[PDB]
Design a protein around this ligand. Structure first.
Ligand SMILES: Nc1ncnc2c1ncn2[C@@H]1O[C@H](COP(=O)(O)OP(=O)(O)OP(=O)(O)O)[C@@H](O)[C@H]1O
Ligand SMILES: Nc1ncnc2c1ncn2[C@@H]1O[C@H](COP(=O)(O)OP(=O)(O)OP(=O)(O)O)[C@@H](O)[C@H]1O
Ligand SMILES: Nc1ncnc2c1ncn2[C@@H]1O[C@H](COP(=O)(O)OP(=O)(O)OP(=O)(O)O)[C@@H](O)[C@H]1O
Ligand SMILES: Nc1ncnc2c1ncn2[C@@H]1O[C@H](COP(=O)(O)OP(=O)(O)OP(=O)(O)O)[C@@H](O)[C@H]1O
Ligand SMILES: [Mg+2]
Ligand SMILES: [Mg+2]
Ligand SMILES: [Mg+2]
Ligand SMILES: [Mg+2]
Lengths: 17, 375, 375, 112, 122
């Protein structure tokens, strides 16, 4: 049960004005 | 007289200046009552209906804060990011050309005119590092006179006597390692050092309140552990950058790594976890790296000295090693004297044997209890 | 006296010029004073209420920055992607049409005008680490003579005699490794070669400090490790690209990796995280691949030689494996001489026996102390 | 969360009630007399023994009695296995948040 | 940029270079004979071995040979006579966003299918 770090993946977001 | 406002951009030898006004750039002359040479880049200046500068003001505006990324080579412009990951290059204002500007510092910017007017320092603030000033002082610790003198010579003495060390060309110690058995007192000495530093920065220098809070950067071991890859590294770099920027000539900044044994440990030990092959080298490189600290003392307290990695224990990182020992009979007597004060209510029948002399009575009780435990 | 501004777009044989002004595309005649022949695309010009070009000026320095996508066939246009993935075809101004514009570059662009002006890297962070070059040189390092000779042969010698290397058809070493027990002086050599390189760069081209420092990069360890997938690899790609621009076959770029074990592993020793499994192949491809760095030297330092991946410790990648060993008696004498300088004050009692001769007294003191410790 | 178990519900462990009272209940009743006498009030109690004997009941009864005695007191009940995650550091950050809330509540001066 | 390494600069491997040279050229050297036997050209070539044994060397030689061949066949040396070799680093296609890397994969293979012809290898 070795503990592990993580690497996240961003989700692009849409913004207008 | 209704008068306008605009943002100065640059000055010329023609005594005319470029100003961002009404969303567009204008070359305008200056009134004879205002000096054009006295003006500075990124200045809020007054205008009028004939489009002539009449007054100059402070560099105050309401603007979005951008995380500073890097200053350009020419030294006048810098790249910043935005909330929507918008990166733009902005000229520096006069106050921002003051403390040295560093990446990761928020800057108030007007993206239409593209000037970073000032830097907001409260946005980048760390309250986890700050520690409440302990009541404990040097006089409150007994039985460790040698260790107190050693830590005094390590920390307080070099800044009190600077010219004397410069005559001998001696640099202040760049690390202290307090270590020893459990309870014998390691956090108490850290509290005393923090209190002494707080007093020295409070009344000797007189800067202001909360200035003492700023120094003695205190972090516990497990606090640095995070959930991501290379996130603890960012915290280490940030805390060391803060220590570097806060420390001045003769100004000591102390970072206390309480519980040095558990944190870092020894590289290559521990099948379950592998945080070691990431955290220990950041600390190994921040201290005694290519670019070294100037007036920063790193104090580490450990109950398991041998557990700590040797690369950070060798001289040059943790030079002054102070060992706390278990109290002896005289040390136990001193510790009792530090707690069995004469302000405690003493029973009358207890005082009967010595005719009510509380000082001698308490000294005798301390002797009796020390003898009883050490028999 | 109040005059406007605009951006030049194109020139015609009618002695007229297209100018973007006040958010609209207009055509103007030039003043008789200004010559339309000398104008270049993208230049900023000054206008008036009569809408006449009166003076040309330098290109814009601030605005939005966008990543370059490709260069079109005509050569005057290029596709650029904005912060929110908007793509626009924009003209290339005179400064871009120096180093060849290549995709993956962040060009400063005015979207409404549609012109690109310049580009700036972010890897400066590493160049920002060595803000102050260390003052130590080889004269201040003792106990290592063969190692200094090898490190000079690896870096200084090929550039001092390029014609001899060309005649013998020998290229400068691609990489150098420094390994040894902790505290033996690896960072000293690493920070002294940087000083030597800065001195060389200042004396050869220009006395400017920033350009001289711009040839040594300090990785400092796990600084490349990042939160998001595929970001640290792109950081390495940018670092090596920035390295490949600055090389001119007469100027070395030294990328120093400190504590090699931090980011380098066997790809199987990783327990908690295996980011190194992705990181290592990227850097191996960068060093030696289809396209190889012609004149970039990578200097690596480590304390555990075995933990490093076998692929890196291969000839043609890390050619010379300099090993620093623990000092002997003569090396100890040299190190002591480097510190026990003659200018240090010495007691009159010690001066009594050697008739005040500071140098001989200090020397004999050095042999006495090394003999005491080496017993 | 407001505990409702009282000392009356507990049966056969009155002596344990009298020891546990002398460490948490009595100190906050007349803390002024203690700071006059300079005593340091206790900090932590470990209820240990065979399971299913009402270890949680004793703590809930103590908290309820302290709340009734006060004339505002705040109590936090966090079970063990909740503070467990496979990712590195999360279990420590949960403890940090719990104790941060504890200091937030204790800042007023009410018992926590 | 096209490397200058050729087959004459590789030594000690006269069998492996023969295999890769066949797999690259012979389906295109003799297309009529291949269609005579209905032999489909191979679509997967792997080069494996201990570090520093010449794998990237053979890759560079293959790229140089392809560039020279396409320079001989047609023109547009600026990008043509080289666009047919696509050099991809290992982690280079990895991307931050969830689906962008998959789009890169599909788009790379789509272009590789478009640019390819029966006489021009990709
Ligand atoms: N002069 C003294 N020497 C030793 N302990 C003292 C002294 N004065 C007070 N103490 C008491 O020692 C106790 C432990 O002090 P401290 O926490 O500094 O020790 P420690 O060895 O760092 O502990 P730990 O092993 O838990 O890290 C406290 O209760 C403190 O009040
Ligand atoms: N000739 C010398 N040989 C070895 N050390 C020296 C010499 N001269 C000075 N030193 C001192 O040795 C100290 C350690 O230097 P350095 O940081 O290079 O060791 P290191 O081998 O890099 O340590 P680590 O392996 O832990 O990174 C320096 O602070 C320097 O003052
Ligand atoms: N005086 C009492 N002694 C023991 N159990 C009681 C008493 N009064 C009620 N109980 C019942 O015992 C049950 C278990 O209570 P509790 O959870 O406190 O036991 P526990 O010792 O905490 O168990 P565990 O050791 O598994 O945590 C409760 O549902 C309660 O109804
Ligand atoms: N016949 C040959 N066999 C092996 N190596 C050679 C030969 N001829 C030249 N070399 C040299 O070997 C070096 C390494 O070649 P190459 O990069 O192909 O090895 P590699 O297997 O790709 O290494 P890695 O496995 O680390 O990627 C080249 O720089 C080349 O100069
Ligand atoms: Mg302690
Ligand atoms: Mg070092
Ligand atoms: Mg229970
Ligand atoms: Mg290879």
């Amino acid at each position: 049960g070795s503990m592990a770090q993580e690497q996240t993946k961003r989700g692009g977001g849409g913004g207008d004005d | 007289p209704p008068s306008g406002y605009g943002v100065l951009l640059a000055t010329h030898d023609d005594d005319t200046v470029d100003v961002f006004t009404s969303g567009r750039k204008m070359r305008l002359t200056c009134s004879p009552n205002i000096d054009a040479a006295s003006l500075k880049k990124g200045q809020t200046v007054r205008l009028n209906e004939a489009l002539t500068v009449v007054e100059a003001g402070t560099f105050e505006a309401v603007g979005e804060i951008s995380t500073l990324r890097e200053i350009l080579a020419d030294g006048h412009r810098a790249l910043v990011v935005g909330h929507a990951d918008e990166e733009r290059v902005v000229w520096l204002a006069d106050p921002l050309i003051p403390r040295k500007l560093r990446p990761g510092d928020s800057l108030l910017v007007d993206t239409k005119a593209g000037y970073a007017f000032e830097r907001i320092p409260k946005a980048e603030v760390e309250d986890l590092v700050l520690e409440e000033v302990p009541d404990v002082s040097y006089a409150d610790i007994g039985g460790l006179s040698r260790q107190i003198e050693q830590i005094r010579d390590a920390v307080e003495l070099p800044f009190l006597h600077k010219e004397l060390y410069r005559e001998y060309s001696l640099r202040p110690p760049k690390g202290v390692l307090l270590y020893g058995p459990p309870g014998c007192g390691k956090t108490l000495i850290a509290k005393a050092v923090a209190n002494s530093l707080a007093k020295k920065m409070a009344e000797v220098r007189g800067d202001d309140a909360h200035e003492a809070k700023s120094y003695f950067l205190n972090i516990k071991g497990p606090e640095l552990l995070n959930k991501f890859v290379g996130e603890t590294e960012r915290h280490i770099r940030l805390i060391f950058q803060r220590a570097r920027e806060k420390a001045s000539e003769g100004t000591p900044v102390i970072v206390f790594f309480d519980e040095m044994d558990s944190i870092f440990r020894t590289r290559g030990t521990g099948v379950s976890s592998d945080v070691e092959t990431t955290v220990v080298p950041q600390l190994l490189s921040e201290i005694d790296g290519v670019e070294g600290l100037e007036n920063v003392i790193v104090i580490g307290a450990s109950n398991r000295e041998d557990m700590i990695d040797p690369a950070i224990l060798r001289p040059g990182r943790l030079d002054v090693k102070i060992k706390i020992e278990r109290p002896d009979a005289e040390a136990a007597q001193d510790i009792y004297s530090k707690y069995l004060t004469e302000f405690l209510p003493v029973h009358a029948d207890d005082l009967a044997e010595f005719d009510g002399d509380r000082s001698a009575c308490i000294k005798a009780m301390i002797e009796k209890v020390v003898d009883r435990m050490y028999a």
